[PDB]
């Protein structure tokens, strides 16, 4: 509202139906889950080497000075590529594209 200068709050909305749900707290949770899983997030790739013992769900220190990053992150995905010798770390969250 404040950003765009809208007359009234900037509602963006979905309607869901879950007919077999009888309890209101479950319906709330479904709505909350819907909001949460598409709420804005840091994601993205850091390319390194090694880290064969690293699993998703693990934590790692990452320093990238040109990017202003000096944090401890959760690993969402690891990709190992021979030939090019790359370990690609997806941090915080992974989201698809057309797939999603």
């Amino acid at each position: 509202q404040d950003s765009l200068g809208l007359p009234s709050p900037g509602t963006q909305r979905k309607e869901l139906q879950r007919p077999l749900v009888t309890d209101i707290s479950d319906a709330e949770d479904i709505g909350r889950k819907y909001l949460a899983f598409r709420n804005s997030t840091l994601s993205g790739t850091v390319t390194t080497y090694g880290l064969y013992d690293a699993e998703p769900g693990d934590t790692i220190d990452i320093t990238i000075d040109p990017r202003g990053i000096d944090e401890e992150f959760v690993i969402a995905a690891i990709e190992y590529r021979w030939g090019v010798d790359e370990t690609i770390l997806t941090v915080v969250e992974k989201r698809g594209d057309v797939d999603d």
Partner: protein
């Protein structure tokens, strides 16, 4: 020259300067000018489609990434030659992306515009027995955050609605109304005002 750097009578007025030529896009970010921009794409579309902009700029130690949280106001102004600045895009940030492009730290900002608010809202009331003019008033005032001005509405074939539009996306309902009427244009102006009026 610049003031205070020349003794009088010694130099020519406004030298070494000359008239502006070429095209310039200025990006404004919550009122601040973004200075390191090297490319701009602005797309403006009819209603089925989203209006968007992409801005490309250089960043240093992630200082510029920090300026563009989701929902940040972006404006794009255009000038060619010595023409006044024209506000061509207004929108909100949906994606900020920073990646290495062959050594360069490239920041790409993507922004959507006001047409998202007609798209991501649903009709809540039953407009059965309303005229299209009455329906537009109800829908825009109740179901959308954009401003309603009765003078921007010109229905070319006003008729009563026999369907309850009570779950449709607002955009889809409006398009159905346009189909029933004289094929009118609708949308949100830069005034933040809704319009519904004859084409061409």
């Amino acid at each position: 020259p610049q003031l205070g750097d020349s003794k009088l009578g010694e130099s020519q007025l406004g030298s070494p300067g000359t008239l502006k030529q070429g095209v310039e896009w200025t990006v404004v970010v919550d009122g601040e000018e973004q200075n390191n921009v090297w490319d701009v794409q602005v797309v403006d579309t009819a209603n089925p489609f989203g209006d968007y902009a992409v801005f490309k700029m250089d960043d240093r130690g992630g200082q510029a990434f920090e300026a563009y949280p989701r929902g940040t106001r972006v404006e794009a102004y255009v000038s060619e030659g010595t023409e006044p600045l024209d506000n061509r895009f207004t929108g909100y940030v949906v994606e900020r992306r920073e990646n290495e492009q062959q050594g360069a730290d490239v920041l790409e900002v993507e922004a959507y515009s006001f047409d998202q608010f007609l798209r991501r809202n649903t009709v809540t009331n039953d407009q059965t027995g309303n005229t299209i003019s009455q329906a537009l008033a109800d829908i825009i005032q109740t179901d959308t955050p954009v401003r309603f001005n009765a003078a921007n509405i010109t229905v070319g074939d006003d008729q009563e609605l026999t369907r309850s539009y009570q779950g449709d996306p607002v955009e889809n309902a409006l398009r159905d109304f346009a189909f029933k009427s004289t094929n009118e244009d609708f949308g949100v102006g830069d005034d933040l005002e809704f319009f519904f009026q004859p084409r061409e």
